[PDB]
Design a protein around this ligand. Structure first.
Ligand code: SRM
Ligand SMILES: Cc1cc2nc3c(=O)[nH]c(=O)nc-3n(C[C@H](O)[C@H](O)[C@H](O)COP(=O)(O)OP(=O)(O)OC[C@H]3O[C@@H](n4cnc5c(N)ncnc54)[C@H](O)[C@@H]3O)c2cc1C
Ligand SMILES: Cc1cc2nc3c(=O)[nH]c(=O)nc-3n(C[C@H](O)[C@H](O)[C@H](O)COP(=O)(O)O)c2cc1C
Ligand code: SF4
Ligand SMILES: [K+]
Lengths: 570, 518
């Protein structure tokens, strides 16, 4: 028996306060309906502050004016963050028109923030508009149920495969997986959709009364594209096809990127390969893995509850055996899959169905009406004109899918005039950041408002070094949680303090290697100096088609992380 | 013979006190009673009745005389047979309504057959000459601050401790929280009092006005018994931020401008002009080479502005807090502002020199019984005395219930003292709070709508002997809130509109319905 994983199946100890909140909430109801009707405070009091996440909203305040309002004898500007549940990122143009209208009208920021999990976010929603947003989401056939707190997160799917014929099956299976793992509770419909109460109790056969120990994240991967970053999320279904049709899935369990600064018990590890499962067993396997995580999770520690920690505690073999027993199947040996890259395909891409896919690069996924750059208005006009549907990408980009040849010229004309696909360097296309300031409560440094200037400087640096045609996956997070996935990039900047980051190098082009910490608590000028030296080194003594992370590992300037549960911090 | 004094700030009070003095010296009898302690329902048993009154926001009498005024309008007033009456009314020509309360009192007292021995006369802000010439004729045709040294004339020279905005950056209105350290002077006040703040005109505004008249700014002018330069006088002793009709027609008469002469003789046009433009913009429309003496004669003496105290000495000790709503408006792109509000907002440094005094208001006080429920309606800058009330009640650990009605355009920006109200409702001091944000949705919602919504609970509280307090705007808010109260009382009391008005007048008599409006 390996000593690496000697822990028990279930840890025994005092349960966290979150588990008590889930237990005593009466199946995600709480007093949210009552708390909506008070005007004294702009937020949710008591356990509702965390129970509203189960319904998809985060209570937030603007951190740029938090102290100013504190000294102004004013409460923090409590506004809700509404994240929608969009399995696979596919949103219809009618739904896009609805969400655009709501963001323009009933939202403080007036912006649609695309996320890296292939869904959008509404920021600055007042408590009086908390119910109308859910009403309109239901009106256009959407919902925000179980997209926050401890349930299955938004299910991802590769939004633009090279052979864009498996996307139909992959998106169908992503939607089926998302609907299967939804909570079987009527709290969401009773509170927002105003459905008559049923004189019986809920069951939750899939998640239980206390639900999952932590957030659960699932993906559907179509090789060789890895834009969804399957190693940052718990369950990954790597699609496998024979003769052009889906035949099965590859299951990879144990993802996660969140760490804690200076806590060796928290680490970011890549998902571990389980095995090949026939196509018809996808739902059973997802159920088995989710229930195994629910049973064997660490509910006594919230920094030890994610599926990666459970995998490293109970062992991969025992977890796989339990999944096989629960699903009543046997995991076939993994059929080989390869990954070519991780970025998006910006421009016009031809599909098999004689339709063109237009991927628009939106900087930081923020859709707004900028001066001389009306992205929101152009997107609205496209939605009015387009007859297909929009696909949000895991790189916070938007894909205008299914454009016919006749309408290709019109769509290009409206998009180009609105500054949606203006000229942008290749480096900026593979550069991403989390929301961070001014909305994220846990943000330590700037990521979204720091990424544009940083990438401008980096583009100038590459132009100076004569490598401006090449690109480096550069992700900046203002938090150790790794929401911008800085713990999978070639160069990652995790926030530590306002203006200070930790520089991480040694990543991978395909995102299958955590970047080891290089220098910590260094301001921006130190980061640019170090990156100037390293890019100058890379621009000369590299090989043909070599990435920056591969060069940094090979040149010996940094050492790669092999087993992140042991040597990530060492 | 009885003299009736109807005054809130107290300018009619001193006139009535001097009047009763020489009446008791000359005739005999003559008793003096305020409108608040007058048994007004026994008016028919009077021999001689002299009324000295004031004028509030728009024509309404002082809050203690509102009960008597509504009695005279209630069609239940008795028919007078053996009483002679004379009405003396104060006022200010700057406001729209000039001594209309006295006009109404005189007209009604004549209508019920009272003998008008002396015709009604009008008084401006300078009432010394009119009062002196009126009391002599009254006497002729009739013979068959507690202890503090500080007052309006000698204000306390205090210091500004805190000047903090209490509205969000996205607020269209600028509301300041002004904390003034009284020092060791020992100035004492009570909740419901007002802090009379002496101010100074903007040096930039004074300079612009002086150069707009092609003057220098240092030419000597005569002020009181001393000689001071023009800038000093215009900054310390004369009012520039308020335009009156009299100022406009005097400028026209001593200027003969083609753009001002046709307006002379039209009261409506003159008043609209005065209310629409400041003095400096009005003189910008027509410079006229006016000298320093003409400018000094044209303007009016500077007067302190009252601000409801937003603190209780049971909590803040030797400090006074005032919630100052800064008046800011733009004329043709030039940003103008009010005198005292902008003086406190911008022109006083921290620990700066501010001359203040206390304007005691007895008819706006918390109940003497701590168990009495309290209902407060304080939208806008009317929340200050209710902050003082809450501090005083929390300090005394009063077990009585408290109800607050607050209203403002935006919840996230215009909720004054929001954290304080959250804390007060946390500890049970403020039992119930109702908020009406008029600019948060498509339809305007004000405090009166919330009073209408909570009619049953308001009626139960009133039956429990609750006190109703109104503080804020008087042009629209006070009338709307009074109408909402009348509707609630009539609906939930099983009685019509007239009986509701009588019930409200009774509440005024029992010192249970009290207003501090402006
Ligand atoms: C928007 C997004 C980043 C982005 O710019 O795209 C994001 C934004 C936030 N994340 Fe995240 N997370 C986002 C992807 C991620 C991912 C990356 C991924 O899924 O591909 C991770 C790292 C991978 C992982 O955790 O396995 C991630 C790990 C977290 C964590 C750490 C969880 C943990 O294991 O400890 C937190 C903190 C928490 O859960 O309390 C967090 C918390 C948050 C919150 C809700 C902050 C909070 O707790 O209140 C953020 C709201 C920001 C705001 O103001 O709007 N976010 N977050 C992503 C939205 C995903 C979605 O729409 O479903
Ligand atoms: C008992 C009492 C209590 C009070 N309590 C408070 C309180 O708690 N808080 C508070 O803020 N005030 C309070 N006030 C009012 C206060 O005394 C002042 O009236 C107020 O603060 C404005 O002072 P000011 O000298 O700056 O304005 P002024 O300079 O005297 O007025 C500005 C002038 O400009 C005019 N004007 C305004 N807007 C425009 C426009 N857009 N275009 C053209 N002309 C315009 C006005 O009509 C006015 O003539 C109270 C008053 C009283 C009597
Ligand atoms: C808020 C406010 C509104 C006023 N409105 C008028 C008015 O409409 N017409 C008028 O003649 N005087 C008006 N005045 C001036 C008062 O009538 C004046 O101050 C009067 O002398 C009150 O003095 P007293 O309280 O000592 O009796 C107003 C004063 C204030 C403070
Ligand atoms: S990584 Fe930290 S700062 Fe960035 S979005 Fe996540 S929680 Fe916020
Ligand atoms: K991007």
């Amino acid at each position: 028996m390996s000593e690496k994983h000697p822990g028990p199946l279930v840890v025994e100890g005092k349960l966290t306060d979150a588990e008590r909140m889930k237990h005593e909430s009466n199946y995600l109801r709480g007093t949210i309906a009552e708390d909506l009707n008070d005007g004294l405070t702009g937020g949710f009091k008591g356990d509702n502050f965390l129970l509203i996440r189960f319904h998809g909203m985060y209570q937030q305040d603007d951190r740029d004016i938090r102290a100013e309002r504190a000294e102004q004898k004013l409460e923090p500007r409590h506004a809700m963050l509404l994240r929608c549940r969009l399995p696979g990122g596919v949103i219809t143009t009618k739904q896009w028109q609805a969400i655009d209208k709501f963001a323009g009208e009933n939202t403080i920021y007036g912006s649609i923030r695309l996320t890296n999990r292939q869904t959008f976010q509404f920021h600055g929603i007042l408590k009086k508009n908390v119910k109308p947003v859910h009403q309109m989401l239901h009106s256009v056939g959407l919902d925000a149920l179980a997209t926050a707190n401890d349930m299955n997160r938004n299910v991802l799917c590769t939004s633009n495969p090279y052979e864009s014929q498996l996307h139909a099956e992959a998106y169908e299976w992503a939607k089926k997986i998302s609907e299967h793992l939804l909570p079987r509770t009527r709290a969401y419909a009773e509170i927002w959709l105003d459905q008559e109460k049923v004189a019986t109790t809920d069951e939750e056969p899939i998640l239980g009364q206390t639900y999952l120990p932590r957030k659960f994240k699932t993906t559907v991967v179509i090789p060789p594209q890895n834009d969804i970053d399957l190693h940052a999320n718990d369950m990954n279904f790597v699609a496998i096809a024979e003769n052009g049709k889906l035949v099965g899935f590859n299951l990879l369990v144990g993802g996660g990127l969140s760490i804690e600064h200076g806590n060796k018990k928290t680490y970011a590890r890549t998902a571990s390969e389980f095995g090949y499962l026939p196509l018809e067993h996808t739902l059973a396997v997802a159920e088995a893995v989710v229930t195994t995580q629910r049973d064997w999770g660490n509910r006594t520690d919230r920094k030890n509850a994610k599926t990666k920690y459970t995998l490293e505690r109970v062992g991969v073999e025992t977890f796989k055996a339990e999944v096989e027993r629960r699903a009543g199947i046997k995991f076939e040996p993994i059929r080989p899959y390869e990954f070519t890259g991780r970025g998006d395909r910006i421009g016009w891409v031809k599909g098999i169905d004689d339709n063109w896919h237009l991927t628009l690069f939106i900087e930081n996924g923020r859709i707004l009406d900028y001066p001389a750059r009306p992205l929101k208005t152009g997107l609205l006009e496209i939605a009015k004109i387009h007859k297909g549907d929009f696909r949000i990408t895991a790189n916070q980009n938007l894909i205008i899918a299914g454009v016919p040849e006749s309408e290709k010229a019109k769509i290009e004309k409206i998009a180009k005039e609105s500054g949606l696909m203006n000229a942008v360097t290749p480096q900026r296309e593979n550069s991403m950041a989390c929301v961070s300031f001014p909305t994220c409560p846990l943000a330590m440094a700037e990521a979204e408002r720091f990424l544009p200037s940083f990438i401008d400087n980096i583009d100038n640096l590459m132009a100076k070094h004569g490598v401006s045609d090449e690109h480096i996956v550069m992700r900046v997070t203002g938090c150790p949680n790794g929401c911008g996935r800085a713990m999978l990039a070639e160069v990652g900047l995790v926030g530590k303090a306002p203006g200070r980051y930790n520089l991480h190098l040694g990543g991978n082009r395909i995102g299958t290697r955590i970047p080891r910490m290089y220098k910590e608590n260094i301001t921006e000028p130190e980061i640019l100096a170090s990156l100037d030296e390293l890019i100058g080194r890379w621009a000369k003594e590299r090989e043909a088609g070599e990435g920056f992370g591969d060069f940094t590992v090979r040149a010996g300037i940094i050492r790669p992380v092999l087993d992140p549960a042991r040597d990530l911090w060492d | 013979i009885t003299i009736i004094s109807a005054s809130q700030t107290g300018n009619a009070r001193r006139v009535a006190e001097a009047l009763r003095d020489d009446l008791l010296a000359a005739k005999l009898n003559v008793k003096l009673v305020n409108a608040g302690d007058y048994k007004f329902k026994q008016i028919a048993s009077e021999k001689l009745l002299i009324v000295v009154t004031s004028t509030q926001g728009c024509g309404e009498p002082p809050e203690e005389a509102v009960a008597l005024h509504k009695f005279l309008f209630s069609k239940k007033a008795p028919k007078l047979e053996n009483t002679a009456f004379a009405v003396f009314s104060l006022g200010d020509s700057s406001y729209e309504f000039f001594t209309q309360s006295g006009k109404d009192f005189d007209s009604k007292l004549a209508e019920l057959g009272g003998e008008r021995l002396l015709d009604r006369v009008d008084a401006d802000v300078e009432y010394q000459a009119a009062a002196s010439e009126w009391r002599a004729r009254v006497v002729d045709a009739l013979k068959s601050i507690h202890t503090s040294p500080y007052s309006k004339d000698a204000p306390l020279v205090a210091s500004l401790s805190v000047n903090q905005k209490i509205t969000g950056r996205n607020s269209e209105k600028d509301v300041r929280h002004i904390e003034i350290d009284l020092g060791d002077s020992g100035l004492r006040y009570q909740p419901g009092d007002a802090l009379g703040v002496w101010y100074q005109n903007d040096p930039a505004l004074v300079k612009e006005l002086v150069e707009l008249l092609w003057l220098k700014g240092d030419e000597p002018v005569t002020v009181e018994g001393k000689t001071l330069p023009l800038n000093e006088a215009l900054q310390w002793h004369f009012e520039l931020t308020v335009n009156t009709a009299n100022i406009v027609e005097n400028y026209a008469t001593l200027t003969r401008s083609e753009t001002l002469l046709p307006l002379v003789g039209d009261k409506a046009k003159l008043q609209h002009y005065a209310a629409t433009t400041p003095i400096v913009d009005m003189v910008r429309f027509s410079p006229a080479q006016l000298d320093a003496e003409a400018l000094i004669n044209l303007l009016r003496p500077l007067t302190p502005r009252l601000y409801s105290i937003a603190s209780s000495q049971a909590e803040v000790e030797n400090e006074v807090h005032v919630t100052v709503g800064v008046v800011r408006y733009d004329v043709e792109g030039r940003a103008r502002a009010g005198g005292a509000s902008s003086f406190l907002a911008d022109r006083v440094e921290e620990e700066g020199e501010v001359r203040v005094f206390i304007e005691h208001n007895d008819n706006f006080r918390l109940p003497a019984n701590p168990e009495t429920p309290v209902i407060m309606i304080g939208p806008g800058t009317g929340i200050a005395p209710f902050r003082a009330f809450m501090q005083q009640r929390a300090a005394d650990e009063a077990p009585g219930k408290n109800w607050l009605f607050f209203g403002n355009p935006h919840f996230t920006e215009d909720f004054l003292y929001q954290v304080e109200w959250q804390r007060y409702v946390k500890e049970g001091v403020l039992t119930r709070i109702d908020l009406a944000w008029s600019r948060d949705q498509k339809e305007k919602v004000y405090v009166q709508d919330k009073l209408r919504e909570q009619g049953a609970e308001l009626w139960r509280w009133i039956n429990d002997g609750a006190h109703i307090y109104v503080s804020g705007d008087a042009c629209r808010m006070a009338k709307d809130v009074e109408q909402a109260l009348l509707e609630v009382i009539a609906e939930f009391g099983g009685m019509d509109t007239e009986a509701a008005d009588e019930f409200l007048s009774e509440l005024r008599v029992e010192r249970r319905y009290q207003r501090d409006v402006y």
